[PDB]
Amino acid sequence: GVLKLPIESIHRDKDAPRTYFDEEKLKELSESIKAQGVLQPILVRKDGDGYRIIAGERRWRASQAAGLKEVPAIVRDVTEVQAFELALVENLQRADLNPIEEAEGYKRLVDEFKLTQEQVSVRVGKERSTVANALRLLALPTDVKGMVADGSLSMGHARALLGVPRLPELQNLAKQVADKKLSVRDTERLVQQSR
Amino acid sequence: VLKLPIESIHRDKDAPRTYFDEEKLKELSESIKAQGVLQPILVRKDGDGYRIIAGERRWRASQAAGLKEVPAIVRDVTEVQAFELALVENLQRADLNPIEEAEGYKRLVDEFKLTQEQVSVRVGKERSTVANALRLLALPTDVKGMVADGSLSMGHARALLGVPRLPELQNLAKQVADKKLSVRDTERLVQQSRSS
Numbered sequence A: 001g002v003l004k005l006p007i008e009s010i011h012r013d014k015d016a017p018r019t020y021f022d023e024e025k026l027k028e029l030s031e032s033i034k035a036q037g038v039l040q041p042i043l044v045r046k047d048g049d050g051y052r053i054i055a056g057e058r059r060w061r062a063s064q065a066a067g068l069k070e071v072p073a074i075v076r077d078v079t080e081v082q083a084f085e086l087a088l089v090e091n092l093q094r095a096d097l098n099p100i101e102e103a104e105g106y107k108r109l110v111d112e113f114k115l116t117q118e119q120v121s122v123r124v125g126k127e128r129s130t131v132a133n134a135l136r137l138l139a140l141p142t143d144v145k146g147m148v149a150d151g152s153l154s155m156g157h158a159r160a161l162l163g164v165p166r167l168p169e170l171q172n173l174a175k176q177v178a179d180k181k182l183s184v185r186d187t188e189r190l191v192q193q194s195r
Numbered sequence B: 001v002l003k004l005p006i007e008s009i010h011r012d013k014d015a016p017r018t019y020f021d022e023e024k025l026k027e028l029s030e031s032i033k034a035q036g037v038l039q040p041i042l043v044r045k046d047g048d049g050y051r052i053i054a055g056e057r058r059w060r061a062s063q064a065a066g067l068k069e070v071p072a073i074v075r076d077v078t079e080v081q082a083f084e085l086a087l088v089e090n091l092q093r094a095d096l097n098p099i100e101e102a103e104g105y106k107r108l109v110d111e112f113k114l115t116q117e118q119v120s121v122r123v124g125k126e127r128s129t130v131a132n133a134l135r136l137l138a139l140p141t142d143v144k145g146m147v148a149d150g151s152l153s154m155g156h157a158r159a160l161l162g163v164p165r166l167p168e169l170q171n172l173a174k175q176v177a178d179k180k181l182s183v184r185d186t187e188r189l190v191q192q193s194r195s196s
């Protein structure tokens, strides 16, 4: 079952599959926990006199940084090998929102739920500039946004194409760009050449 | 540990995700066949059942895996609160890099004495994904760091694995990055190195 465990009763798996912990992203996670709490319980197993993390070390670290004293958890009675299988599955079996889906999510918070970009930043735990730049993508033509969504155009390519004044030109330059895997720098030059 | 009947759960028609990759859903389903659902889905009471807040892929993949029930957490929230939760669940995550992933498969094989096929079944990943990831670990240390930080794609790395001698491979890898060579250009340049 999902119970609240004292944060100090939980310790990390020194053999966790993640070895790099990005500081900035851990801070984004902690800000989201200040706003929303921990949405998904961490997985632990009894270990020593407390619990060893199976999956959820970032949540545990970020909860500490947010000043929480307890964390939602599920206690699993599993072997070492199955605990490691679970650690891998938890991280590997996921699909992120694409950039347009993310942007449209912020847009709904702004339009339907009447939040400012700053308020969105606080509720979701993202830098306001991340929210602002995501929303700017939605001004792209439908076909261009589709290319950002399926990854054929990076957010950097899309940002450069936002400079084109004419929507037909934008569409024309985007076709040339993504077709040739043309570089962001070369895309910026093309936009200049167009205007 | 709350399990809800899978038929009592329905999707949020306004969910943030519109695109559902079928290959990735199949992998998710294979992982559920082996491990169950690790992460309870978040739901809210709706009609006579429940509306998903976060967990539509888990719910669809559980159906495909033949489960009759899914672990769930019932949240009593407003619509704006439910939508914020849906966004945060997806946006506040950090993936393992490709070398961290490959080293995980390696530990299952070397330390826990699994076969590659067993790794595939237990983690829900295609046979070839596991094999290709493990092959990355033969790369030199500096080239492995390029894969880890995204400078070299796994497709580039795979072609570079054809280079027989390590000094040539490291030289070629820098050219790939310096010159932003496609995978297919990288293959060309590897093939020539093989001719000598």
Ligand SMILES: Nc1ccn([C@@H]2O[C@H](COP(=O)(O)OP(=O)(O)OP(=O)(O)S)[C@@H](O)[C@H]2O)c(=O)n1
Binding pocket: A016, A018, A029, A032, A033, A036, A037, A038, A039, A040, A041, A054, A055, A056, A057, A058, A059, A060, A090, A091, B088, B089, B090, B092, B093, B094, B095
């Ligand atoms: N307020 C929040 C924001 C995010 N999350 C969930 O937190 C997990 C993060 O996923 P990850 O970045 O992989 O970190 P994690 O903890 O699993 O460490 P670890 O063992 O891999 S090193 C994902 O499920 C997110 O929906 C949450 O519950 N509450």
Ligand SMILES: Nc1ccn([C@@H]2O[C@H](COP(=O)(O)OP(=O)(O)OP(=O)(O)S)[C@@H](O)[C@H]2O)c(=O)n1
Binding pocket: A089, A090, A091, A093, A094, A095, A096, B015, B017, B028, B031, B032, B035, B036, B037, B038, B039, B040, B053, B054, B055, B056, B057, B058, B059, B090
């Ligand atoms: N056997 C497994 C394999 C994966 N997972 C977790 O399943 C979530 C998938 O994450 P996502 O790909 O975003 O799919 P999801 O369901 O949330 O739909 P949704 O509302 O975004 S559209 C992540 O936490 C994974 O650790 C699990 O619990 N059991």
Ligand SMILES: [Mg+2]
Binding pocket: A055, A056, A090, A091
């Ligand atoms: Mg994780």
Ligand SMILES: [Mg+2]
Binding pocket: B054, B055, B089, B090
């Ligand atoms: Mg999700």
